[PDB]
Symmetry: none
Subunit: 143 residues, 2 copies
């Protein structure tokens, strides 16, 4: 019943609401398209309600969590953004983008220490060029 | 163990929300809805649209809101959006397939005959609303 109940269950139950309600994949893909669409267009308030809905209906989806964490970061909700970034990362660990962003966040949360901890790790592990350049400047600019 | 889901939900739950701070009184919420709705029935679309979007932002998990907006998009022929929102309704819905039927209508006008096909099918397969399936079938046999 009332969407919170559905959530507590799905948690305990270990599967996503997306599965539980058996929603098509072509549906969650059209919803993510729209969500993103807002996001790019800058509309953070609209983009957030879709990314929140997607994160609820599929708490395992990296693409979704990243979407929402971007949003939290934009609105300077740094801790939340970090929390979501961590998950995104555990859910991947092949991927280093959320590691960078965590760094950024640690910074704005006046924790310079942890901040560089993440940045060094990007450079070291990400094959992503554009991403090592960034990670490096933050490391140089911090000193 | 996979308290991944717990973290995601706990992080999402840290922020306040319009509905969550309890600043708007219940009767006002009702009145805004009835006006939004009422505006819809009298063909005052532009306004109807603005209020339903508000309603969807105030509570995106309330199906009557998502449908209202969805239905507005459909009437305005913004079929892909109508589709996007009926998808949400469908997901919030408890076994209701009305959104799915409407998705089908939309896909049809969006030149995806093949998607249309599976919605209608999907209806017939799982819905009870008889009146509904009777249209889902009419649509099915018309595309062929």
């Amino acid at each position: 019943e009332s969407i919170s109940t559905a959530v507590i269950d799905a948690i305990n139950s270990g599967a996503t609401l997306k599965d539980i309600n058996a929603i098509p994949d072509d549906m969650m893909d059209d919803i993510y398209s729209y969500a993103y669409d807002f996001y790019n267009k800058g509309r953070i308030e609209e983009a957030e309600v879709f990314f929140r809905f997607l994160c609820i209906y599929d708490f395992y989806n990296v693409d979704y969590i990243m979407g929402l964490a971007a949003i939290y970061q934009i609105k300077e909700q740094f801790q939340q953004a970090a929390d979501l970034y961590a998950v995104a990362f555990a859910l991947g660990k092949n991927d280093y983008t959320p590691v960078f962003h965590t760094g950024q966040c640690q910074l704005r949360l006046k924790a310079p220490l942890k901040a560089k901890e993440c940045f060094e790790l990007v450079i070291q592990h990400s094959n992503d060029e554009k991403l090592k350049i960034k990670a490096q400047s933050y490391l140089d600019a911090i000193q």
